[PDB]
Amino acid sequence: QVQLQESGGGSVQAGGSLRLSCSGYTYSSNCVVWFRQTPGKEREVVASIYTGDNSTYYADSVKGRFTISLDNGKKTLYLQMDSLEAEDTARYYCAAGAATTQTMVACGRTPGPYELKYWGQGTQVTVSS
Ligand SMILES: *[C@@H]1O[C@H](CO[C@@H]2O[C@@H](C)[C@@H](O)[C@@H](O)[C@@H]2O)[C@@H](O)[C@H](O)[C@H]1NC(C)=O
């Protein structure tokens, strides 16, 4: 069995950049998603990638401001955050596996359902300004 692990958080001045790293996914083909937990607010999908065809879904707010990348062996997924804004301040979560078929179709394409079998605790980002 496996549990996802995250790293790369902290406090950074606006206009800065910072790399978020998720590790643990054994899947050659499955869905990996990064959420954001704005404190005392709702969960928001940041981005998703389907390892099978490397299809990428990027949330419109972070569009062109964030990048999602996978190391060789597809053993680690990085979310490189650029041009950080105070709104992005939150705790960021990584998760993978797709329980619902209709999450599976939407991964890398639409916001969709995005329901996920395995989750990790994640790390906190504070955008100083
Ligand atoms: C999927 O991509 C694999 C390599 O990842 C690519 O390069 C890294 C540096 C990241 O930028 C990542 O986002 C890129 O997709 C390939 O080894 C693999 O063959 C690709 N598979 C398919 C089906 O395209």
- CA 30, CA 96: separation in Å to the nearest integer? 7
Query: Residue with the nearest Cα to atom 10 of ligand 1?
Result: 69
Residue type, 96: A
Resolution to 1 decimal place, in Å: 3.6
The phi, psi pair for 104, rounded to 5°, reads -55, -40
Q: Which fold has domain 5-121?
A: Immunoglobulin-like (2.60.40)
* 104 pocket-lining for ligand 1 (C-beta < 6 Å): no
Indicate left, alpha or beta for 114 from its phi (over 0: left) and psi (-120 to 50: alpha). left
- CA 107, CA 104: separation in Å to the nearest integer? 6
In the reported structure, the alpha carbon of residue 65 is separated from the centroid of ligand 1 by a whole-number distance in angstroms of 20
In the reported structure, the alpha carbon of residue 3 is separated from the centroid of ligand 1 by a whole-number distance in angstroms of 23
- CA 102, CA 21: separation in Å to the nearest integer? 26
Distances (CA, A) of 43 to 14, 72, 108: 22, 30, 18
Half-sphere exposure of 26 (CA within 13 A, CB side): 4
- Domain map (residue ranges) of the chain: 5-121
Beta pairing, strands 55-58 & 66-70: unpaired
In the reported structure, the alpha carbon of residue 32 is separated from the centroid of ligand 1 by a whole-number distance in angstroms of 14
Rg (alpha carbons) of the chain, rounded to whole number: 14
